Amino acid sequence: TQQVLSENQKLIANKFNQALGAMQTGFTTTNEAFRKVQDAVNNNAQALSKLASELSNTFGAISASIGDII
Amino acid sequence: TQQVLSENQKLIANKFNQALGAMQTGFTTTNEAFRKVQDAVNNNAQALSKLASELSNTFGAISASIGDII
């Protein structure tokens, strides 16, 4: 039974290590994905803010100028 | 001691398998969540781009059509 327990134990350690590697790959991939999400949300928020800022600035400018027209 | 060690081994294997199921549920859930995040960011980027394109095209059109008056 001794060698049966040794074989059992080795198999336990093996399956453990395999699951461990799979998990490391998993969390690493999740981290990369979170990088991509952060950069995308940030870029599109930036573009949106630029759009709003330009629209507001020019609309105020015209309000002023044609205001002077009156 | 061999019997106690075999029993303890069984408990190790059981808790291990349970943790395995929990992790599978975790990574699967993370994958679905990343699906939803991707689809949302993509849809809103698309809507934003449509908005900007509409504003720019129409403002060029008006620029021309009021330019011709003079």
């Binding site: 990369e32 991509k36 995308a40 930036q46 | 395995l20 699967t28 995040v37 960011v41 980027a45 781009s49």
Partner: peptide, 30 residues
């Protein structure tokens, strides 16, 4: 300065590979 899109399907592929590799590590209790 630009509108960008988001592609995570490589990451999702790798994640499902990791999940399958997780199911392939079951102890079978023997």
């Amino acid at each position: 300065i630009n509108v960008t899109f988001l592609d995570l399907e490589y990451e999702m592929k790798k994640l499902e590979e990791a999940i399958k590799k997780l199911e392939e590590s079951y102890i079978d209790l023997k």
